[PDB]
Amino acid sequence: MNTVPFTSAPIEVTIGIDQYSFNVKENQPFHGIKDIPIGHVHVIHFQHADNSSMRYGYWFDCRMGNFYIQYDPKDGLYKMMEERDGAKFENIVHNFKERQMMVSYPKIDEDDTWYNLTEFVQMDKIRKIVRKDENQFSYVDSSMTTVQENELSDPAHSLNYTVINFKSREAIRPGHEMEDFLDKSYYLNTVMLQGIFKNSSNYFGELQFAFLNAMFFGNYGSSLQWHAMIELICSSATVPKHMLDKLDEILYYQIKTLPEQYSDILLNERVWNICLYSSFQKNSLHNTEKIMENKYPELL
Amino acid sequence: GAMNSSNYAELFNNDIKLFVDDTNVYRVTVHKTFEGNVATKAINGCIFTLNPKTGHLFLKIIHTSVWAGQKRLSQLAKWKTAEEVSALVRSLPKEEQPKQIIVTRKAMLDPLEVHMLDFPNIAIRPTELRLPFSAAMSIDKLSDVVMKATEPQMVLFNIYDDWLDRISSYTAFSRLTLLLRALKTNEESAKMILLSDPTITIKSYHLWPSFTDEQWITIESQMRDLILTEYGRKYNV
Numbered sequence: 001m002n003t004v005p006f007t008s009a010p011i012e013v014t015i016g017i018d019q020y021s022f023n024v025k026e027n028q029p030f031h032g033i034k035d036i037p038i039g040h041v042h043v044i045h046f047q048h049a050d051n052s053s054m055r056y057g058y059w060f061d062c063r064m065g066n067f068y069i070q071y072d073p074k075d076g077l078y079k080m081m082e083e084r085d086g087a088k089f090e091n092i093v094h095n096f097k098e099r100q101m102m103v104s105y106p107k108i109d110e111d112d113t114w115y116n117l118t119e120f121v122q123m124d125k126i127r128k129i130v131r132k133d134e135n136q137f138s139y140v141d142s143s144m145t146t147v148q149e150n151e152l153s154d155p156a157h158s159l160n161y162t163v164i165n166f167k168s169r170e171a172i173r174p175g176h177e178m179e180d181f182l183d184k185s186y187y188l189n190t191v192m193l194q195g196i197f198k199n200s201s202n203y204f205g206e207l208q209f210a211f212l213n214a215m216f217f218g219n220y221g222s223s224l225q226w227h228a229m230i231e232l233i234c235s236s237a238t239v240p241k242h243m244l245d246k247l248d249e250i251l252y253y254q255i256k257t258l259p260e261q262y263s264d265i266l267l268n269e270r271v272w273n274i275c276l277y278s279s280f281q282k283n284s285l286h287n288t289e290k291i292m293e294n295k296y297p298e299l300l
Numbered sequence: 301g302a303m304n305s306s307n308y309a310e311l312f313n314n315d316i317k318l319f320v321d322d323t324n325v326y327r328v329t330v331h332k333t334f335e336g337n338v339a340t341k342a343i344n345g346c347i348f349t350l351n352p353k354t355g356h357l358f359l360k361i362i363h364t365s366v367w368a369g370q371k372r373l374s375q376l377a378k379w380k381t382a383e384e385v386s387a388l389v390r391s392l393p394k395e396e397q398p399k400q401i402i403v404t405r406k407a408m409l410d411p412l413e414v415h416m417l418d419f420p421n422i423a424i425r426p427t428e429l430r431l432p433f434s435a436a437m438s439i440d441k442l443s444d445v446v447m448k449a450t451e452p453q454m455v456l457f458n459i460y461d462d463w464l465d466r467i468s469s470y471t472a473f474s475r476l477t478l479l480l481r482a483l484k485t486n487e488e489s490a491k492m493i494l495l496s497d498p499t500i501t502i503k504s505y506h507l508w509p510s511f512t513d514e515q516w517i518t519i520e521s522q523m524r525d526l527i528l529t530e531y532g533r534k535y536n537v
């Protein structure tokens with residue numbers, strides 16, 4: 001069980017760690033988060049009390065180094081940084097743990113929510129979407145735009161998601177215009193799965209990463225990417241049977257976890273109605289359709 | 301964006317553009333079967349592709365063999381239209397290719413856009429105007445060549461005859477849309493107006509009668525009255 005220590009908390013802030021969150025007061029004696037489960041990526045995220053503009057945060061994996069948070073008064077944010085001196089990290093954390101100045105990652109033992117939301121997410125692939133190679137952790141915030149958004153303006157600060165565009169030469173074989181537009185199986189299976197992603201595990205991981213950035217940061221471009229990746233599967237008549245079953249589980253946990261009060265902005269009516277009621281896979285998402293109908297029958 | 305009354309004069313500027321109407325592409329007669337069910341039988345159709353500035357009409361005849369063994373024909377018809385329009389553009393020399401294609405029905409937007417992906421600089425636009433191009437098959441010579449076709453065929457016409465020698469393309473398009481609206485609202489009466497004097501002949505190389513300028517005024521007046529009447533006979537006014 002690993003630990004993300006905090007140098008201090010000089011400004012009042014709501015701190016999130018995965019799906020949990022707690023309020024820290026200005027200069028409250030808070031020195032970090034312990035008992036973080038090993039084996040998963042994690043995200044630690046922030047919303048300042050004074051300026052709710054810019055939710056921001058850091059994706060990280062404690063297996064990859066010793067990370068900590070120190071507030072920067074010049075840039076005005078809580079920054080993640082890696083401590084390369086292992087002895088200093090052990091000693092500072094030991095003092096902090098002995099004075100019980102840390103909250104404990106509050107994982108109920110029955111609870112697989114975080115595993116289910118991050119099953120296919122890897123930092124090595126996350127670093128490809130968020131390019132900042134001098135760090136082992138990845139910064140994301142509410143405002144960052146995606147490559148596809150920029151094409152339609154600072155490239156170093158962009159989310160490099162896989163570009164999906166149903167009315168593009170990549171998606172449409174010359175001579176198969178109607179066929180490929182109405183059944184996207186060749187775009188899904190040949191172009192994307194065989195060509196780009198290399199396997200469905202990579203397809204699911206980016207899709208999951210796109211959702212989590214939408215939910216935690218309100219990142220609109222990420223919500224666009226999530227929906228596009230769902231629509232591409234649902235609009236394909238030919239999808240491996242293991243993929244459909246896994247997609248149903250993936251989406252079920254995403255819909256389960258979504259704050260009820262954010263469904264209006266995070267869920268696209270057209271995509272979900274098309275996917276659940278009109279598409280080739282309208283009958284293949286039983287768990288997702290059942291939770292959507294009992295939780296958001298209005299959207300439908 | 302969409303073409304409407306506010307930007308109407310754009311049709312007659314010097315940027316090449318085409319209207320595409322797919323109304324008459326998939327045409328059926330619905331009838332009873334021996335068992336008392338209903339079935340359709342297709343008949344030849346056409347794509348109506350028109351340059352509103354020059355009057356050049358590219359009439360692609362859609363022979364019933366193109367539907368053989370196909371399903372969801374109304375959907376296929378939109379994609380066949382887009383295929384044939386794209387083929388036509390590719391067949392034209394670059395300096396004759398349109399800079400915009402205006403579809404008369406919004407359901408043609410995605411099929412045409414997808415078929416024209418190779419032409420990113422050609423704008424595909426809808427329109428808010430309720431254009432009467434469905435009535436093209438009420439023009440006897442157009443109807444004749446469509447029904448007689450035994451194979452896919454493209455036939456080229458100038459839908460304005462020689463009118464552009466004497467009037468502008470705005471005026472010619474207005475005359476054409478008036479004639480077609482009349483034929484659409486009451487075909488028999490419109491044809492009576494155009495054809496009840498056999499001495500005003502249609503030239504072999506034309507579609508409409510050889511009216512003098514003054515006769516065109518009288519004809520146009522008669523067409524307006526017919527349209528307003530039918531709007532009367534319809535809504536009772």
Ligand SMILES: N=C(NO)c1ccc(C(F)(F)F)cc1
Binds near residue numbers: 005006067069089093
């Ligand atoms: N200010 C620092 N270094 O100069 C510093 C403060 C705290 C840590 C921690 F152990 F918590 F990770 C690391 C570095």
Ligand SMILES: N=C(NO)c1ccc(C(F)(F)F)cc1
Binds near residue numbers: 123128197198210
């Ligand atoms: N192979 C990929 N395609 O880019 C890919 C796989 C996983 C992720 C993740 F979000 F999970 F980090 C991102 C990308």
